[PDB]
Amino acid sequence: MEFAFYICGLIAILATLRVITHTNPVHALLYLIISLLAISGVFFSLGAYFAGALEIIVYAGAIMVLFVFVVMMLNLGGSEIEQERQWLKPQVWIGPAILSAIMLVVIVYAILGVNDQGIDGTPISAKAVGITLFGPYVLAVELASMLLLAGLVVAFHVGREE
Amino acid sequence: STEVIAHHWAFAIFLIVAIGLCCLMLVGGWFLGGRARARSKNVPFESGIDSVGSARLRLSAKFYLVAMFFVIFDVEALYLFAWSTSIRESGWVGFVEAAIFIFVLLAGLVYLVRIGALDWTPARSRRER
Amino acid sequence: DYTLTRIDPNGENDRYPLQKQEIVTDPLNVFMGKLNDMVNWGRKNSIWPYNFGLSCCYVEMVTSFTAVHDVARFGAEVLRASPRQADLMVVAGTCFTKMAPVIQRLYDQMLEPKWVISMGACANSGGMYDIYSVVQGVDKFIPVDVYIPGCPPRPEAYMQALMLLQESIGKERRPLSWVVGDQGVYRANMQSERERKRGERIAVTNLRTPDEI
Amino acid sequence: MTLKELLVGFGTQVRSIWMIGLHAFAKRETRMYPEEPVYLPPRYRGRIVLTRDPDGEERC
Amino acid sequence: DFEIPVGGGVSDCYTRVMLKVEELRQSLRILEQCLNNMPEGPFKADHPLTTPPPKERTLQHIETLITHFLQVSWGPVMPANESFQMIEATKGINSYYLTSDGSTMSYRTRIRTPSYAHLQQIPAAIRGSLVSDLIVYLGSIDFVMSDVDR
Amino acid sequence: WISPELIEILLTILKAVVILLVVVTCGAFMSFGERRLLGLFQNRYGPNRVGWGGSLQLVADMIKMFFKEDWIPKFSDRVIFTLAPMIAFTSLLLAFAIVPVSPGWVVADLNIGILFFLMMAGLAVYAVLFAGWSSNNKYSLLGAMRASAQTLSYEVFLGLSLMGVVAQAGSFNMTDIVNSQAHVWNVIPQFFGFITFAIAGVAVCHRHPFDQPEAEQELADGYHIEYSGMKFGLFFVGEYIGIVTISALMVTLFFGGWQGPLLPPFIWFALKTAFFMMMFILIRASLPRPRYDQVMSFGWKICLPLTLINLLVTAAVILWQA
Numbered sequence A: 001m002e003f004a005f006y007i008c009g010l011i012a013i014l015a016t017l018r019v020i021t022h023t024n025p026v027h028a029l030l031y032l033i034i035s036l037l038a039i040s041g042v043f044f045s046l047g048a049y050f051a052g053a054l055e056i057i058v059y060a061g062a063i064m065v066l067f068v069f070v071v072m073m074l075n076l077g078g079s080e081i082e083q084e085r086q087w088l089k090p091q092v093w094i095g096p097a098i099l100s101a102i103m104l105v106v107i108v109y110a111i112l113g114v115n116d117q118g119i120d121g122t123p124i125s126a127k128a129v130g131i132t133l134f135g136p137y138v139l140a141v142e143l144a145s146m147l148l149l150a151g152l153v154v155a156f157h158v159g160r161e162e
Numbered sequence B: 001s002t003e004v005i006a007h008h009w010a011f012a013i014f015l016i017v018a019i020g021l022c023c024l025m026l027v028g029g030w031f032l033g034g035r036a037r038a039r040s041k042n043v044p045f046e047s048g049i050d051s052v053g054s055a056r057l058r059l060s061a062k063f064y065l066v067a068m069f070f071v072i073f074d075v076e077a078l079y080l081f082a083w084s085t086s087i088r089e090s091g092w093v094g095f096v097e098a099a100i101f102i103f104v105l106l107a108g109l110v111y112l113v114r115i116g117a118l119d120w121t122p123a124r125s126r127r128e129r
Numbered sequence C: 001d002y003t004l005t006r007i008d009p010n011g012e013n014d015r016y017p018l019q020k021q022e023i024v025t026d027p028l029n030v031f032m033g034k035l036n037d038m039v040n041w042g043r044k045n046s047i048w049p050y051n052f053g054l055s056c057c058y059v060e061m062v063t064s065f066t067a068v069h070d071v072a073r074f075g076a077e078v079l080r081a082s083p084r085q086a087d088l089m090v091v092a093g094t095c096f097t098k099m100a101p102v103i104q105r106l107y108d109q110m111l112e113p114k115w116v117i118s119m120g121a122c123a124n125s126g127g128m129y130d131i132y133s134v135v136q137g138v139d140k141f142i143p144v145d146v147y148i149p150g151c152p153p154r155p156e157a158y159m160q161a162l163m164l165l166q167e168s169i170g171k172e173r174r175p176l177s178w179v180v181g182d183q184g185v186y187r188a189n190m191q192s193e194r195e196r197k198r199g200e201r202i203a204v205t206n207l208r209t210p211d212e213i
Numbered sequence D: 001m002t003l004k005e006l007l008v009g010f011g012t013q014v015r016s017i018w019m020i021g022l023h024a025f026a027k028r029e030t031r032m033y034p035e036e037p038v039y040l041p042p043r044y045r046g047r048i049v050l051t052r053d054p055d056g057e058e059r060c
Numbered sequence E: 001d002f003e004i005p006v007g008g009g010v011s012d013c014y015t016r017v018m019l020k021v022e023e024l025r026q027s028l029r030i031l032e033q034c035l036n037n038m039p040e041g042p043f044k045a046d047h048p049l050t051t052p053p054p055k056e057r058t059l060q061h062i063e064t065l066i067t068h069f070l071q072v073s074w075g076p077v078m079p080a081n082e083s084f085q086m087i088e089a090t091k092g093i094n095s096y097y098l099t100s101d102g103s104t105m106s107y108r109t110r111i112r113t114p115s116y117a118h119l120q121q122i123p124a125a126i127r128g129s130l131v132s133d134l135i136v137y138l139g140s141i142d143f144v145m146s147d148v149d150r
Numbered sequence F: 001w002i003s004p005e006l007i008e009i010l011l012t013i014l015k016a017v018v019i020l021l022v023v024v025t026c027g028a029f030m031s032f033g034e035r036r037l038l039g040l041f042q043n044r045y046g047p048n049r050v051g052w053g054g055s056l057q058l059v060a061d062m063i064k065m066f067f068k069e070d071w072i073p074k075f076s077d078r079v080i081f082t083l084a085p086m087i088a089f090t091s092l093l094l095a096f097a098i099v100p101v102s103p104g105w106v107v108a109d110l111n112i113g114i115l116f117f118l119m120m121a122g123l124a125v126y127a128v129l130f131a132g133w134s135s136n137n138k139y140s141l142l143g144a145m146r147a148s149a150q151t152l153s154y155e156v157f158l159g160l161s162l163m164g165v166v167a168q169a170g171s172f173n174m175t176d177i178v179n180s181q182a183h184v185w186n187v188i189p190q191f192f193g194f195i196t197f198a199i200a201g202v203a204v205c206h207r208h209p210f211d212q213p214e215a216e217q218e219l220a221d222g223y224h225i226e227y228s229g230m231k232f233g234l235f236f237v238g239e240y241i242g243i244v245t246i247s248a249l250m251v252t253l254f255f256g257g258w259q260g261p262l263l264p265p266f267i268w269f270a271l272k273t274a275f276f277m278m279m280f281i282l283i284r285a286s287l288p289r290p291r292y293d294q295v296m297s298f299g300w301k302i303c304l305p306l307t308l309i310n311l312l313v314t315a316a317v318i319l320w321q322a
């Protein structure tokens, strides 16, 4: 169980790093799919089967429309990759790299300072998540439905051609 | 127990043999059979005449509005996935919450249908007259 | 009793077809010959035609595709619309001058192995159309394996030419792999159907009178 | 679309499926070339020959 | 006795296909009428320019042999005139316009075909539509391309 | 290695391997049976010359595909071009890896089940998308866009069609689902769920009438025109494995799976799966292909509210009898 979690975590880290430092949009989307598959594998190793199930179910459709928009605008041959290459320079990425590194080491210092007892890996079924979702957490569900409705209304209002 | 590790091993062997079989038939297809040489072999197929431009042009999909609605409706679907597995223990009150949820869902769907969204077909292709 | 063809588009040869043919002997090994027989059987018993049509001969070809003739029984019905997925180009129609580059392009876009059946008098020689805008035979610029006389040949004649193509494939030699062995294509110099059927054709004495049915 | 149109379309698809199933329960119409010989009419225009007189000499 | 089906004023793909179905039914009616009533006469005219003459008279009469000999070799001599025939083809209206110079060959043969006009009409009726509508329009026009290019 | 637990593990591994080989062989023989069944539907025979009854036609097809040259175009992105047939072959295989064919014969007894099938469908669309984009052809790009529009059409209600079955069974496991149909099959209470899942499952495999990405009449064979050799065969074999997977899943979800009165359970499962396979072929032979905008409008305006109302009515009926 440790092996699957650690291999999926390493794959997720590598695929995210390849995502943020790539010029090809379709290859970046493929590595993003790989990273989210690895994230769902991490979820499955921790016993949260529903979390990994929703990570593959709803993000396969999310990156699908990302592919649709990439085909819609970004694909132009080598010109788009060449234009994306000029925006990335050694100073340009070395600027915020040390900021991300110092933030990461501060958060790691924070993480290591807490007590630990180990994750037992006991599976949590979708039945318990459904009971808690429609039980103690009513208003989260209802106002999340209203939030998604609001986002849908915003998408309709902005995304019209004419 | 023993059944769980047996099932895990069976699933892992299923994955490994499936991927290895796909790779093996890909390798066998690539290695067997002589190659062909032609002047226009490495040209995209466009019914026998050279292309105008290339196939890497940007193509305006008309259903992008439906796509960014599809993501939202997929998330509503995941909420109903979570509800539907625990209907009996949720009780009638949980049925009331899900009824309100689904009523808001159809209200948004009727709103999308009526305002002209989910309708991207051209005027010549609307089958009028 | 074999002919060897090697192709080279990039070599110094301007006129189509870009290939060289000589007359050689049969190269055929206690297992390589049997494996070559097995792949020849698999290729001859599964031929996928190209959905390429020019004229009326293609209409008779797709008449052969339908239920009253059932060329699917020979495994030759799949009818791919892509040249890459097709194994047989049936030039079924007139080889027009404006479409000869199109025919050459579609022949270039097919992949090894490839076979050519010219259907009808137009595809064979230009037929009745000895005119300014018709190529006098598609074999002017592509190599043709099987010829079908007719205008149009009836669908059973198309299946007869398909069986002749199967008999030609079943005794030819081709490179098994593209990394080991000779890459030239060896095709048999078979006896013609005219001299084969001359014994049974000359001995015909009486036929039914045209007033009957 | 109208609900009546949807019901009519569903019944139409069901009816088409039923008729193709009854086609599966029907008789085959194939003439089995080359196992059975192709029937050709007496005045069918195929291969050209040169014929002889009843005396046995060539008629051309 | 046969009917001519007409539409309602809109030339859809469906309307053209159903009109051709009704034309098929009317052709079946014509075939039934002609099967039930076929005359008992000659299959060739008695004109001297009937090409070729009847075969048995050719095989046993010298006048008929001469007419056959000069009609299949040099060709029938049709006197110098212009002729035109317009018929209802399977895909529309087919017309032949023949100019004879008084010789045994046509001086001018003009063939009018309907598929030429339909393919010229194609951009004005499918502009602004999708490609699927174009596929259905191509399937519902009843054209062949020998008809168009001749 | 002499222990009951290790030989039980070996037996379970062997059963999973047997299931995998049988379903792959059944996909290839299902291609052959599609040819024969289309012949049967269209008053003809199909291939009946290669061996007895044409039984060796599939072997000749495999030999031809293996010895047809496999090429990668210079204008294509090679990695994605090789990757797409692998996904098309393997995604619905992994979807089939949860189908219970018999009591004691299942590869994975997952607690997610139909969730895993939804994951594999959402991963299977990317094969057609990658094949359409990577080949760098115009017809392929149009086919990929049509496939994306089709996924927009079907994936909204693909899971909500089966949420009624999940609600009736009270769990996500296929074993619980086939055990919940001990008294009556699920086609009778979940009939709107049945027809909506039939529509969505035919749309999953891109089978007719939902063959928008590869419509030969429209896009001249569509997205996989550059594919040939064993990649083209991978696409077709993966499609046929998808047909088998969707048929078996529908049998387990709406027709009890292996439950039957007199025959052995595998016999009933195979009979119902072959029934739905020949129904796939009957659907392909029978009805024409609609326009994909009409398909999207039908999937959004009709099928999705139908699944929502079906889930609401199913919940009301379940809580009424509880």
Ligand SMILES: CCCCCCCCCCCCCCCCCC(=O)OC[C@H](COP(=O)(O)OCCN)OC(=O)CCCCCCCCCCCCCCCCC
Residues within 6 Å of the ligand: B126, B127, D001, D005, D006, D008, D009, D010, D013, D014, F195, F198, F199, F201, F202, F209, F246, F247, F250, F276, F279, F280, F283, F290, F291, F294, F295, F296, F297, F298
């Ligand atoms: C194991 C899995 C496989 C199982 C096999 C058996 C089941 C297979 C199911 C196949 C389903 C195919 C569904 C096809 C839906 C097509 C809908 C569509 O796009 O229709 C468009 C057409 C015209 O569009 P319209 O909206 O009128 O025009 C607007 C333009 N201004 O509008 C119409 O045509 C209107 C009518 C639409 C009818 C939709 C389909 C009805 C349900 C499917 C057919 C029946 C399936 C079998 C059911 C059980 C039978 C015992």
Ligand SMILES: CCCCCCCCCCC1=C(C)C(=O)C(OC)=C(OC)C1=O
Residues within 6 Å of the ligand: C077, C078, C079, F028, F031, F032, F034, F035, F038, F061, F062, F065, F233, F236, F237
């Ligand atoms: C290595 C495995 C190779 C399998 C090859 C299968 C070829 C396709 C057979 C079924 C078929 C399909 C899908 C098909 O698309 C088709 O065209 C309409 C047919 O009829 C001509 C068919 O018979």
Ligand SMILES: CCCCCCCCCCCCCCCCCCCC
Residues within 6 Å of the ligand: A095, A096, A098, A099
């Ligand atoms: C054309 C405009 C481009 C704007 C680029 C902005 C890039 C900002 C990079 C910031 C890097 C900070 C690194 C750490 C600095 C020291 C710690 C923070 C300040 C006390």
Ligand SMILES: CCCCCCCCCCCCCCCCCCCC
Residues within 6 Å of the ligand: F018, F019, F022, F023, F026, F101, F102, F105, F264, F265, F266, F267, F269, F270, F271, F273, F274
């Ligand atoms: C057309 C049928 C397709 C079925 C696909 C799935 C088959 C998987 C392989 C099953 C093998 C084992 C069968 C059950 C064995 C135990 C019972 C034996 C007596 C019936």
Ligand code: SF4
Residues within 6 Å of the ligand: C055, C056, C057, C092, C093, C094, C119, C120, C121, C122, C123, C127, C150, C151, C152, C153
């Ligand atoms: S040979 Fe005759 S039937 Fe064939 S294409 Fe030429 S004119 Fe048409």
